[PDB]
Design an enzyme around this catalytic site. Structure first.
Site, PDB file in Angstrom:
ATOM      1  N   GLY A  35       0.805  -1.210   0.000  1.00 31.48           N
ATOM      2  CA  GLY A  35       0.000   0.000   0.000  1.00 31.48           C
ATOM      3  C   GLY A  35       0.839   1.260   0.000  1.00 31.48           C
ATOM      4  O   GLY A  35       2.035   1.254   0.302  1.00 31.48           O
ATOM      5  N   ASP A  93      -2.322   9.453  15.236  1.00 34.76           N
ATOM      6  CA  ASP A  93      -3.089   8.841  14.155  1.00 34.76           C
ATOM      7  C   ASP A  93      -3.611   7.480  14.576  1.00 34.76           C
ATOM      8  O   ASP A  93      -3.590   6.522  13.799  1.00 34.76           O
ATOM      9  CB  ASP A  93      -2.278   8.736  12.859  1.00 34.76           C
ATOM     10  CG  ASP A  93      -3.181   8.538  11.629  1.00 34.76           C
ATOM     11  OD1 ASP A  93      -4.371   8.927  11.677  1.00 34.76           O
ATOM     12  OD2 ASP A  93      -2.715   7.956  10.638  1.00 34.76           O
TER      13      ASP A  93
HETATM   14  O1  LIG Z   1       4.040   2.836   9.468  1.00 39.93           O
HETATM   15  C1  LIG Z   1       4.292   1.766  10.106  1.00 39.93           C
HETATM   16  O2  LIG Z   1       4.901   1.839  11.217  1.00 39.93           O
HETATM   17  C2  LIG Z   1       3.814   0.447   9.582  1.00 39.93           C
HETATM   18  C3  LIG Z   1       4.363  -0.691  10.255  1.00 39.93           C
HETATM   19  C4  LIG Z   1       3.972  -1.955   9.862  1.00 39.93           C
HETATM   20  C5  LIG Z   1       3.038  -2.133   8.795  1.00 39.93           C
HETATM   21  C6  LIG Z   1       2.499  -1.025   8.147  1.00 39.93           C
HETATM   22  C7  LIG Z   1       2.899   0.270   8.542  1.00 39.93           C
HETATM   23  N1  LIG Z   1       1.588  -1.204   7.109  1.00 39.93           N
HETATM   24  C8  LIG Z   1       1.194  -2.490   6.719  1.00 39.93           C
HETATM   25  N2  LIG Z   1       0.230  -2.460   5.610  1.00 39.93           N
HETATM   26  C9  LIG Z   1      -0.313  -1.287   4.919  1.00 39.93           C
HETATM   27  C10 LIG Z   1      -1.627  -1.344   4.522  1.00 39.93           C
HETATM   28  C11 LIG Z   1      -2.211  -0.273   3.852  1.00 39.93           C
HETATM   29  C12 LIG Z   1      -1.475   0.847   3.572  1.00 39.93           C
HETATM   30  C13 LIG Z   1      -0.144   0.918   3.947  1.00 39.93           C
HETATM   31 CL1  LIG Z   1       0.800   2.380   3.567  1.00 39.93          CL
HETATM   32  C14 LIG Z   1       0.439  -0.151   4.621  1.00 39.93           C
HETATM   33  C15 LIG Z   1       1.739  -3.615   7.380  1.00 39.93           C
HETATM   34  C16 LIG Z   1       1.345  -4.883   6.973  1.00 39.93           C
HETATM   35  C17 LIG Z   1       1.879  -5.995   7.635  1.00 39.93           C
HETATM   36  N3  LIG Z   1       2.770  -5.816   8.645  1.00 39.93           N
HETATM   37  C18 LIG Z   1       3.155  -4.569   9.050  1.00 39.93           C
HETATM   38  C19 LIG Z   1       2.630  -3.449   8.398  1.00 39.93           C
END
Ligand SMILES: O=C(O)c1ccc2c(c1)nc(Nc1cccc(Cl)c1)c1ccncc12
Length: 333
Positions: A22, A128
């Site tokens: 994403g 957030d």
């Molecule tokens: O910012 C963090 O600390 C951060 C830390 C861990 C994850 C994350 C964002 N985003 C995930 N997925 C995701 C789903 C939708 C949009 C976006 Cl940008 C990211 C994700 C998935 C699986 N494990 C850890 C993460």
């Protein structure tokens, strides 16, 4: 915004990319040489993030239920995180937006309140907190174990938070602190309880309108201090003691072009009216006293998290001591 294909090189490991997750952006990568899959995020807002991730790198990610950050390395600055499974929105959606029973809400609340306590002790605001920023580690082998993610908005003690989870002090333009995260936590647990957001406002006007309809107008001393108050309310007379009134939807649409919408699946005249909704009727005798007592404690905690004045709002340590979390209300059975 970078690009895709396969593989990237760390200061200490090597990571083969397998899947986009994403949009900075986040990608799923294989820690080469190991059995580990990790999530790598590819980003002054990055400087504040890395510093806060650093100040937490020294803390116990598993003990305080925030996401483990492994290493930082430029490549664009990248951040390697443990792989989590599912955020709370996708969980609810995958469950067809049915309510979550309180016994499963309780351990999620306890883990997130714990993380907020750890953040308040370090003088940190998350800013957030929302269902997308709370992820189940493994819903099948570790049910309802969660991690808080996304410190990109985090700050030490403007336009913050995701709108459905945004505290009145941010809406109104007041001074604020780490207490904004407790308001978001109240909106999160209410949404797990309902299967739908409590206050899904499509604009800041609709947001404060929904809140005011269910909880009453914010007190005059808050309205009179806010830098943004007159976007949503009129003084029917001048101070001292203005007669503050919310603009009506038609009047507000007329001067703004923003058309008000109805996004709520539930409209409550007050938060107490939540206690009864979606209860099982089949409960016999002592099991129904348990459930009725669990809901009374839950709304009691919910109202203290959704207290409009931030000075009177319950703190993380105090919610960790609330009977809904500790379950002392159930010893009376
Ligand atoms: O910012 C963090 O600390 C951060 C830390 C861990 C994850 C994350 C964002 N985003 C995930 N997925 C995701 C789903 C939708 C949009 C976006 Cl940008 C990211 C994700 C998935 C699986 N494990 C850890 C993460």
């Amino acid at each position: 915004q970078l690009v895709q294909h396969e593989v990237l090189c760390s200061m200490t490991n090597t990571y083969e990319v397998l899947e986009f997750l994403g949009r900075g952006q986040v990608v799923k990568c294989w820690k080469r040489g190991t059995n580990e899959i990790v999530a790598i995020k590819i980003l002054r807002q990055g400087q504040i993030e890395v510093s806060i991730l650093a100040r937490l790198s020294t803390e116990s990610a598993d003990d305080y239920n925030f996401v483990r950050a492994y290493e930082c390395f430029q490549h664009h600055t990248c951040l390697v995180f443990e792989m989590l499974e599912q955020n709370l929105y996708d969980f609810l959606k995958q469950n067809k937006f049915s309510p979550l029973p309180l016994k499963y809400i309780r351990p999620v609340l306890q883990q997130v309140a714990t993380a907020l306590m750890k953040l308040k002790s370090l003088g940190l605001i998350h800013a957030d907190l929302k269902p997308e920023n709370i992820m189940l580690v493994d819903p099948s082998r570790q049910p309802y174990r969660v991690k808080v993610i996304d410190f990109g908005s985090a700050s030490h003690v403007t336009y913050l938070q995701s709108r459905y989870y945004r505290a009145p002090e941010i809406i109104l333009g007041l001074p604020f602190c780490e207490a904004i995260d407790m308001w978001s936590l109240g909106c999160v647990i209410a949404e797990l309880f309902l299967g739908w957001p409590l206050y899904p406002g499509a604009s800041e006007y609709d947001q404060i309108r929904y809140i005011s309809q269910t909880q009453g107008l914010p007190a005059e001393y808050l309205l009179s201090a806010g830098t943004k108050t007159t976007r949503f309310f009129n003084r029917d007379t001048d101070s001292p003691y203005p007669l503050w009134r919310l603009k009506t939807p038609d009047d507000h649409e007329a001067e703004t072009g923003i058309k008000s919408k109805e996004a709520r699946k539930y409209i409550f005249n007050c938060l107490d009216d939540m206690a009864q909704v979606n209860m099982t009727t089949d409960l016999e005798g002592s099991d129904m006293l348990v459930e009725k007592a669990d809901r009374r404690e839950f709304i009691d905690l919910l109202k203290k998290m959704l207290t409009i004045d931030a000075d009177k709002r319950i703190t993380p340590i105090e919610t960790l001591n609330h009977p809904f979390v500790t379950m002392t209300h159930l010893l009376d059975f």
